[PDB]
Amino acid sequence: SYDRAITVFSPDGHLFQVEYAQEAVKKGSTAVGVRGRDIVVLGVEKKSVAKLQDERTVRKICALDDNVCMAFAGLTADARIVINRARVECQSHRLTVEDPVTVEYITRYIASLKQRYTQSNGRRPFGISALIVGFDFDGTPRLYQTDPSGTYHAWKANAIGRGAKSVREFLEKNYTDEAIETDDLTIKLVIKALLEVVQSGGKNIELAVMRRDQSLKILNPEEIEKYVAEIEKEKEENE
Amino acid sequence: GYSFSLTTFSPSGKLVQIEYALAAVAGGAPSVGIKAANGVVLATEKKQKSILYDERSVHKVEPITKHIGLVYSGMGPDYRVLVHRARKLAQQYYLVYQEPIPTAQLVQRVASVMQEYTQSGGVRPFGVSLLICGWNEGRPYLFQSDPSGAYFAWKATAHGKNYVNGKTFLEHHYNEDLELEDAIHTAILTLKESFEGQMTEDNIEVGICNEAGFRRLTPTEVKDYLAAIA
Amino acid sequence: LDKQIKEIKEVIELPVKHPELFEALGIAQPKGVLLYGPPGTGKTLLARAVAHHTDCTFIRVSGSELVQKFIGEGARMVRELFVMAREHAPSIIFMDEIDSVQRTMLELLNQLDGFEATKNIKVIMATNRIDILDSALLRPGRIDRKIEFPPPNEEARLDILKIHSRKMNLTRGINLRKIAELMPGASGAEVKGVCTEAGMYALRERRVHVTQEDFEMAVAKVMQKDSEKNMSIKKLWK
Amino acid sequence: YDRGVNTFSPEGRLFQVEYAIEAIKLGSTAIGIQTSEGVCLAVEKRITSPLMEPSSIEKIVEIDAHIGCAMSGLIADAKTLIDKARVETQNHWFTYNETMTVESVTQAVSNLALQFGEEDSRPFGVALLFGGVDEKGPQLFHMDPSGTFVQCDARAIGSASEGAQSSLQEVYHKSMTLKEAIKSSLIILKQVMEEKLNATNIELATVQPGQNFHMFTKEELEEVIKDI
Amino acid sequence: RYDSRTTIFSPEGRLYQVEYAMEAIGHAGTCLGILANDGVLLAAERRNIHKLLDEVFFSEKIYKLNEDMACSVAGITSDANVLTNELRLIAQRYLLQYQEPIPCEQLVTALCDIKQAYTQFGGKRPFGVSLLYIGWDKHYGFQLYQSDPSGNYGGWKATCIGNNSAAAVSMLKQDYKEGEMTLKSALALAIKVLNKTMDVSKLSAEKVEIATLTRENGKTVIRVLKQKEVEQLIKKHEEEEAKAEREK
Amino acid sequence: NQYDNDVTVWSPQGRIHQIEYAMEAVKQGSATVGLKSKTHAVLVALKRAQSELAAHQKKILHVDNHIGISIAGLTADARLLCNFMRQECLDSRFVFDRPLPVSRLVSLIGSKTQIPTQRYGRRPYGVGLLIAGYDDMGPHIFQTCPSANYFDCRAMSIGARSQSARTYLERHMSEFMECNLNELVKHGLRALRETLPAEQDLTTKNVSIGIVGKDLEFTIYDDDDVSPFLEGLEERPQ
Amino acid sequence: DRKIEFSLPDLEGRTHIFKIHARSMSVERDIRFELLARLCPNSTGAEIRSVCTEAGMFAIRARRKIATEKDFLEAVNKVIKSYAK
Amino acid sequence: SAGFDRHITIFSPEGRLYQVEYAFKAINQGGLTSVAVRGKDCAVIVTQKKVPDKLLDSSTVTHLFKITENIGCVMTGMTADSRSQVQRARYEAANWKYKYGYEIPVDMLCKRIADISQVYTQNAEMRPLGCCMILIGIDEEQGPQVYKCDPAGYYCGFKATAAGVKQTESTSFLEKKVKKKFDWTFEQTVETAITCLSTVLSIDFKPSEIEVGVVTVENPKFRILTEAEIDAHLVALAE
Amino acid sequence: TGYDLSASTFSPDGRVFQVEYAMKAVENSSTAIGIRCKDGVVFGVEKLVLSKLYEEGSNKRLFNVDRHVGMAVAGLLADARSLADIAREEASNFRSNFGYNIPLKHLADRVAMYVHAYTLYSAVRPFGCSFMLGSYSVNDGAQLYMIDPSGVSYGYWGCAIGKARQAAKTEIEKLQMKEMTCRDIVKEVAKIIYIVHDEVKDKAFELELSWVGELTNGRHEIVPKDIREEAEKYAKESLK
Ligand SMILES: Nc1ncnc2c1ncn2[C@@H]1O[C@H](COP(=O)(O)OP(=O)(O)O)[C@@H](O)[C@H]1O
User: Which residues carry this modification: N6-acetyllysine (chain G)?
Assistant: First the structure.
């Protein structure tokens, strides 16, 4: 048997189609998020909005609920439909159920959505992966990622392929078991990962930081440039 | 090859299956349709594998309203099915808007219909291209709908087998200020150029849209107009 | 067409005339050339011309033999052409219509990556249509530019006419300028074709004709071959 | 003869679900043992990244307090089976007001396992180990994508499952105490998977007839670490 | 051969069908969205310039669906028509359930989601149509957006789609204008870009279709240019290039 | 071969090789034994083991107190038909409150299994069954095949190595008709021993029995019932 | 006439083949071959030969003119686990 | 030509009705031939009832059928499909009379059957009916008609027509006959059909070999001629 | 080859080979004959003894559920059972709606239309058996019918389906079915069964008979060879 069909096993049991979904994600750009002492911080890179194109329509980050936001890497159409599905799911569950929503339920829901759209022929799996941030682990922060194979997991920090190969190794080398001292060092580590990222010029890099008690916050390019310069100076006296 | 299925693109960004349906349009019997200052003319030719037929038992020119003319070039059965659905759609619009179908509305709706068969491999698009003429707002108009599910307008047009010479004749012969009878004469002339053999009332039928209403030429009228073509 | 001559000369004639420049500035010599444009329209006419001015051996390969299509000899035939070219250095290798199987493509890429430029041996491979494969070939060590062949302009088509106009006679006032403007967007060989189809129009009267009117209908029958279904194609693709 | 499940192979087998059996090989190994003292399940982790939350891998999951569960296969179909099992057990309690016996769980889960080609899909590339202490005492079962299920005194499923199963067969008998069975499973895992065992790269779970709750082990593996 | 069906993935992880769709618009048209201020315009060229095509609708590339929305079309005509009617239906539904004009971005994203859904599922084919729209709303006012078969929407100060898009985007980068870039400067830029993208000299008016939206009429209006004003624009461009030749 | 798509494909030979593969899948099952007297019906099974620390796969399933089954094939379809017969027995007990006769139930299973054989989208139920049932009309021992066909046998055996059994039952059918229950189960055990390899012998672990009678409800006779009947088994001489 | 079946070596077979290959190699006559074999999964005999050669390579990289048991172990991890990754 | 003809919905590169022609070839395999001829006030049908064996009952192998008490029918094709389409035609006529109340002329019936056949041609779910249709009927105050419908869905009226194996020869005979304007009366029409068939098969028929049906303005009730009437017609042609 | 794989796939010339495969598969099955007298119809079927595991009367090929119709098959037994079920359902439908007995012509027509309907759609295959239909009606006449898996049915004075087709047809031809009564028909049917390859290459066979007529109030019953054994010994009269 071969990979020409969604539901067909390889003779050694592999499903080459979902592996191709993961690889189609792997061609997608860098996406690295971490959870700090209290805050969860993310950084959007490689947008490269060229002059005539506007950066507003890029949608570097979309907030599902006040305690969860997402952007996904890969195909923007699939990212958008999954954003709409997650937003509708969380809002409807909070509105309808006798008790409100937690990030774990929406994590399960999106994992189930990927597994479902992956499960049958005539229905292409999503070619996107995303790194989930939640505020209400009894007020504590927590971090997941999602995968086209309908797979999710929890991390102290996570990255995906294009950013994984370099940045994630840099994190596993650097990540201190002590949570980054305050959101200041959280943003410092995010900027360091962006330094491990390809270009780090600040022309398209933007970040969104969520404190797990405060709602989501959006960072301005000027503050991002100031943080990048601070990290460059810190590397400068590191000699 | 890529024409095996209609649901996929070619690397050249072409739908090979839709093209071959238009080849069946080329295999259709040529029809000539031109507009005049006072109306529109739709002419077509017929031939029989034997004189055993009742050549008047069926009609190739069909109306959709009392003031609409319509002619095709393709295989008969798909044409007749499309005519039935077009008449029913016109009736539905008459029920809804309390008005008869406008020519533009009719052509867009029938083209959307003919697009409805352009999805999924279990169905096949019509091998029929349509010529539509009608009166609207006191002025004559004409268009054409093709198996692609689209439409385009035309002051002078024709299609079928050996259509390119008809195009050349229309380019070098048609002007926008022609008169209805002279339009019928031009139509029969370009049909005679388009098909071999003598053109007689057994061989051609023509429908003309007048602003008040549309009618199909009787066999005696076909004999009279076909005779003394210049 | 003029821009084609300069860049091909800079990439073929120049590496032939002054190898000292590339060694003095310490560069690996340019290795490959690739041509975009409508089929022919000076495509082969250029490659054949440059080889004459450099006097190097010209190799002509059609796209047809490239695509033997039954694993004919594509694996080794590429090498056999290459080795013979090295034996007759300096030489120019030309292939046309690459668009007209994957295994011999990898074979060519490896040879393109592997053979030495120590013999003024270069590859000029030409194409007609814009293909997805073509953009993949533009890689390090294989090809270095994107020469384009546009359809000839009004005065440009006139020069094409004048190229074959030496042999043909003329009336007391044949204005090729007015004849030139009647075929907008026509390719090059078709401008030869209108001269070609004016050819047996001289046989239509079985004597010296080459008349101004002749080209006016020598235009007529040429354009339709460059035509016909293009009228429908609008009603087809739309 | 590989296009679909609904086609019989020349020998009578199916070369579509036999590969679903092959998918068990690419999954991590897991150990399950049934003893009169209790039922224990062991799961290998092979830590993939220090940044991962170790418990985020659901290869050890509970469907009810009287019963245990372990996994070897694609974690997505794994979670689907896990959810289905929790749903059937909870509904069985809702209707009967009693615990769902482990054999009934294994049977009722398998009906969802029997949907690859008989309704109106594809077998789930997951093989499971169930461990329950109920009205029939301590119980350990194994079930595979083919839909067959078996009551097991011991079982090892996953990658390198064959050698572990062979060694366990050489050592284990159906009259051990629970602790020595756990020790045998632990030494077999330590032999097979990576290195000296610890909470990071192995997971352990065990349920008892007198303790029909908390199969899980959370840093009480330290006794195992100092012992084995 | 991993390009047969839209729902399969290839061992390099790309969708050959959707790329085939992009290449299908690659030869569709030359429709463009102009960078402009005080008013936004679309410019379209028709490959149906003929002595006998009637253009009865007085427009075949532009289609207006609001008092503040309009669209320009380049792609498969049947897909284009069904997409425009679907947009009309979406606008009708939004106006019915909100009693408020739709935001442009919400509408275009809804269409792109529908297109993505049409691509995702089996037995179904991507709409090989890319079309440009403009709109004024209470969220962002002047807005210009582009959509593609894959289900992606592109926001642009200026953009051009169809054949020879590379030259248009390169010159729009080169001849770019910002801020004070009035509608008349946009007309000049559109004229120049279409003259270069087309092979013609003295670009004929009947080969171009242009529409625009103006907000000095702040109750909002959309205009489609006739032949005479376009011809005057052509004459203005001709005299501009003549002056540029006089600048030698 | 082109002719190995779904059962919809008729072979030129007048066969449908999918059905023959289903019969082979029947032969894929382990040895089974089924035999009756004029008052009882008994089926004997050989429970295939997996390991010294795993239980043998069961072969005898309970459908109703008056009808019993024994399976040989891919257990999924076996259990699906088992649930089917359970449902039909329940409906029979519900409508007129009457134990369902064997013949009508077996005909229903035949029709149900036949529908896939004509229709694409579902492989036919590929499991071999032995059926033991007693009703108010007579005692019955039955077999069915994935070809949607069923056979009423005085004595029947399906599975691997079953031919030695089949010879045993064919030779001894002059005896069973009025043999007692103990003699009938001894005959079944002797039939099972014929299929045994020289290196394996019967025991409670691998032997399963199922008995139904006119005054004895169908029950499954596992290890506990196997223990007494093991005595009186024919030896293994040479 | 005769069909001869070859199966993957068991623990006894693995010990025997390790004895066979290690005999010609320069090692200390103190290695626990049985430990290596039972550490070895269903790995074929070619795997035993390759592991012995890789242990020799490990020794060579340190220029130790005797191999060590440590080299045998590290070769086992290298080969077996690198493929078993 | 080859390859693209394997499915009915696939247009060959030439854009031709290949599966339609294959249905026609399935028609021609049955060694049969039929004809319908229109007269001044009569319509005549006759077909070859080539009885293969004597052990069958001749009543059970008829190929003339009454679909309406005043409309006739004649078959050419495989028996099962012919029975199916005559049942369908009877149902369609009955439904028309149920809905509209008054008559369903042969024109409507054949047009409807041809339309439905076009439907099966259009969708790939079911194989097209590989048999042809010929009918006769009297019209309101105008006269008799003969209509021919085929698997392609082609549908038209006929002054004379033929079906079966012997298409071209029978049609040529009819064409040679019809060029002259004369009183094509009932006896002359049936004689012309009979002699056409007796030459195209070139056999001196015994009466059991053929079946004759007729409808006429003076006798609108459709009739199937008895064997004795067949002998009377034969001795009429005997002169 | 090629244009063969589906019942809906036409051949480039002629008809679908799927149907032909169906009827030839019918040709290789066990033989079944049916002969009708003036007022009644008699059937004959040969059945193979399987092994001694068989139970002297199991899996027989004679089935009859209708107040005046007898029915026997010659083909694969599973499709035979399914077609018997369809015939029973159609007969019950007619009896429920119309309220009276169905003419055997109409019943065979509907059953054969359903059979051919199983040949039209590509998702379904033609049947693997051919069977015969026998009845009498006091109102209009006596009937016999023969139906094949191709959806084609005819009425016969006598017919024979199985691996005896032409030889058994000739054995039918020697009879005078117009005027004979069903009492002699049973004897000739059983003898004809035995003469035509009873166990030439086959080991042995079992014979079963069916008999419906006006003399038995129109209803069908299996003629008992448990009594009078006259056709059985009549067959052995023909051994030499
Ligand atoms: N620019 C040009 N000027 C003159 N002749 C041309 C030109 N382009 C093409 N031709 C004609 O084309 C022929 C050479 O073949 P060409 O079209 O260059 O390539 P190919 O052999 O691939 O068609 C010559 O006969 C020449 O007359």
Answer: 85
What are the start-end ranges of the H helices in D33-101?
Answer: 75-96
Distance of alpha carbon I149 from alpha carbon F130, whole angstroms:
31
Number of domains comprising chain A: 1
Q: What stretches of chain H adopt beta strand conformation (E)?
A: 33-38, 42-48, 64-68, 71-77, 131-139, 143-149, 155-158, 160-164, 210-216, 223-224
Residue of C132, C224, C235 lying closest to B152 (CB–CB):
C235
Q: Note the resolution in Å, 1 decimal.
A: 3.6
Chain D window 6-45: which residues touch A at a Cβ cutoff of 8 Å? 15-17, 19-26
Residue C38 among known ligand-binding residues: yes
State in Å: Cα C191 to ligand 1 middle: 9
Q: What is the domain partition of chain I in residue ranges?
A: 1-238
Task: Kindly state the tokens that stand for B160.
Answer: 């079928």
Q: Nearest Cα to F14, choosing from H213, I19, E83?
A: I19
Top CATH class of D2-228 equals: alpha beta
CATH label of the domain that carries residue E72: 3.60.20.10
The answer to whether residues A105 and A163 touch, using CB atoms and an 8 Å cutoff, is no
Cα distance from D54 to chain A (closest Cα, Å)?
A: 8
Neighbours of C227 (CB within 10 A): 10
Strand partners, A34: A41, A157
Domain boundaries, chain D: 2-228
Give the domain CATH number at A56. Answer: 3.60.20.10
Bridge partners (DSSP) listed for residue E208: E45
- The backbone torsions φ and ψ at residue A208, rounded to the nearest 5 degrees and listed phi first, read -130, 125
From chain D, pick out residues whose CB is under 8 angstroms from the CB of A156. Answer: 50-53
Contact F117, F19 (CB under 8 A): yes
From residue E23, alpha-carbon distances to B10, C27, E79, E83, H58 in Å are 10, 37, 16, 19, 67
Tell me whether strands B128-136 and B68-74 are parallel, antiparallel or unpaired.
antiparallel
Chains that touch C (3 or more CB pairs under 8 A): B, E
Domain that holds residue E113: 1-246
Name subunits touching G (3+ CB pairs < 8 A): D
What domains, with CATH codes, occur in chain H? Answer: 1-239 (3.60.20.10)
Q: Inspect the interface and report whether the beta carbons of C238 and B167 lie closer than 8 Å.
A: no
* C193 annotated as belonging to a binding site for a ligand: no
Chain Cα centroid distance, residue I213: 16
Topology of the domain comprising I1-238: Glutamine Phosphoribosylpyrophosphate, subunit 1, domain 1 (3.60.20)
CA distances from I49 to I29, I53, I155, I198 (A): 14, 9, 31, 12
Name residue H211's amino acid. E
Which of C157, C192, C195 has most ligand 1 atoms within 8 Å of its beta carbon, as the pocket-test mutant?
C192
| Residue type (1 letter), H233 | H
CB contact under 8 Å between C235 and B167, yes or no, is: no
Question: F1-234 has which fold?
Answer: Glutamine Phosphoribosylpyrophosphate, subunit 1, domain 1 (3.60.20)
SS3 I228: coil
E-chain residues near B35 (CB < 8 A):
54
Q: Which amino acid, I57?
A: G
Q: Judging by beta carbons within 10 Å of its beta carbon (0-12, 13-18, 19+), is residue E64 exposed, middle or buried?
A: middle
What number does the ligand 1 atom closest to the CA of C188 have? 8
Instruction: Compute the distance from residue C40 Cα to the ligand 1 centre, in Å.
Output: 6
Q: How far is G50 from chain D (nearest CA, A)?
A: 20
- Residues F133, F106: Cα–Cα separation, whole Å: 11
| Cα angle: H69, vertex H74, H75; to 5 degrees | 135
Residues touching ligand 1 (Cβ under 6 Å) are C 1, 39-45, 96, 152, 160, 163, 188-189, 192
- Domain range spanning residue A144? 1-239
Structure determined by:
cryo-EM
